[PDB]
Amino acid sequence: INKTIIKQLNKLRSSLSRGYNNVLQKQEITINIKPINKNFELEDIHNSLTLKNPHIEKLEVCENIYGINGWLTFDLAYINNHKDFNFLLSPNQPILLDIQINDSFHHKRTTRFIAIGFNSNSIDIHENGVKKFKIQFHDPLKALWTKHKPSYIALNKSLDDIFKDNFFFDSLFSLDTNKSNNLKIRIPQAFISTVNRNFYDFFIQQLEQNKCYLKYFCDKKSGKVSYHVVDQVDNDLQRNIVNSDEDLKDKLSPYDISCFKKQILISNKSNFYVKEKNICPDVTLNTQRKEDRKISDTLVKPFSSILKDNLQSVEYIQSNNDDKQEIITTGFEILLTSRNTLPFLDTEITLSKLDNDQNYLLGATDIKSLYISQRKLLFKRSKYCSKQLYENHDNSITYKIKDYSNLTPEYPKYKSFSNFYINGRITIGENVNNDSKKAYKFFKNHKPEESSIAEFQENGEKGTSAILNSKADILYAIEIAKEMLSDKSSDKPIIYLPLKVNINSANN
Amino acid sequence: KYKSFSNFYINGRITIGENVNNDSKKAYKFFKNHKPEESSIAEFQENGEKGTSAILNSKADILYAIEIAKEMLSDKSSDKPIIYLPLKVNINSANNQFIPLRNDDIILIEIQSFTKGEIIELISNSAISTKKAQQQLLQRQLLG
């Protein structure tokens, strides 16, 4: 020559108890484990824990473009030895995890992982001479910066100097900030505040608003984690993200038919958006107040008589403009469950293209080249190999596909920070006189320069002696409690700040 | 189940009439009953207060007149946007002082609930200098 073929995958998946998988010649999974010391370097015990023909029950690996999260369950035996003592009987010990995978089919395909797990207040070991273990996964820059919460003030520092002066990890990996140059623009004042949140979540948030990219990457030969922060996707990424294996074909070969399970959609391009009319309720702005927001895209119809208003907080400050955003529409998402790592296709998350020659997907007839944006790896040790190795593996892989034309960065959930309070003086000069003991002086342009209350005073105000909207760009000088800086403070802490005139006042 | 809403901020003027005079440029006037009608600070003044010149509990049902940024209405606005609002007298004051809110000042207004507006801060002045603060040091009121 359809239940003869439809039930055939069931007894195939029932024979996954003991693994009966075509066309895998051999699949082994390796885990190295190292300790990480007091000062973030490496030690020895093959001089480690290393893994083989598995003790492992079940490991779970997902990938974003930036992160790796999941679980690990393996076995050891038995009590008692120093090789197993000091690692997993103490929390907060950082642990490198080096995972390599070969897949022999007439060729081999590799995937390699470097991840850090450590944790407070939770270690998990189950028993009944046989011991279980559990370990969570994080990519290295996350898990180290997760348990790190400082808050201080910086002056005249570009952003990449802030990250390179909080990063103390050189026997582990590096981060490469030499291509962005949005982050190398110097800001006159800087307010780090990990009040109730994570510095890693601070690290994403200001990286979010500049609208940059992150990429996680490992050398397969040999392991070096190296991030990248790029404003675009260029040739200078793809000089580095060429996959270091071969038989690297594209275009969805007809050997994929033997390896799928489910071909699942999430949303697609619509033709119906909701209007989003901006509103800035502001007496004394002599323009339109209602204007529309702007879509990135066209050929999409609006609805009728349904609005999404977008107000703004109107404080005493001279009201600025305009936080130019878009109206974020949908994309094109395909989940693909398959039983093996696919033959003849590049299942490595590059920021490249993958052509669409055919229509065996749900897909769309219009859409050209695509790319990959996730993985999942539920691995299960087979039931048979969990008997003799208990007396003396399965695979399931998904993928996230998006449109290459709809390429955008991806960011995880985090916390927007919370405010906090600071008390401070006002001074003007330093060697201040005595008949000039208590005067007042206003400063121009983030510099100690005598400004005026003139000169700003927009065209309804030239002039009586009356300020409307209590204008910004007039600065005070404020001494701080000095201990909110770095220890390398070759500075005098003076934060310039704008003015509420209406503190010691009336309107009179 | 649903969501109880959250507050938000609105900035607005004060006017009294429309074709306002020039010796009547900056005065103050209080309005009665959700209508443009000259009220008094008398007449409300419950029975412990008739009378010295002292308001306890800063009574409601005394209304200001406040122009809004006009674009917070429908497109069918055959109206002039003037939300009447109650009074904090204690803004430009002490317990000694009495400076009522004149016209043509710009004012923070929360909307604390459905049909509860209040007045918090002031965003304007009428007396500053325009010189470099090495030649003048002005400290003053203005009056009437």
Next chain:
Amino acid sequence: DLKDKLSPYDISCFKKQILISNKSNFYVKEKNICPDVTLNTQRKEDRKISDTLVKPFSSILKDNLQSVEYIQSNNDDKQEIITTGFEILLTSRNTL
């Protein structure tokens, strides 16, 4: 029959002998900060652990601010740095 000391009749009554966390050797520094103009002492001081023989990390800080209101700023809410303990779960089929 109130004995102690884990008699050898317990072997007939266990199912699983499960750990939760233990004493580490690695704590995170927690440097106190009171941002206060006109306190003429140190503003940064460390917090104090209850215990010793535990190594710190390096170049990782947990700041601990304080709300600074108009009040004469007091001191110091003398707390500790709460470490881990030693936890054993013991599933058994009878009262031991």
Next chain:
Amino acid sequence: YINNHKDFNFLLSPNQPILLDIQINDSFHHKRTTRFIA
């Protein structure tokens, strides 16, 4: 199955409003009805 315009434009796009008219008969010696519009 794949592919036809009757199934194309409905369920391959979000934010398309969709009326759902559900009717139920229940024959027992009589019938009882319930009807839904959603």
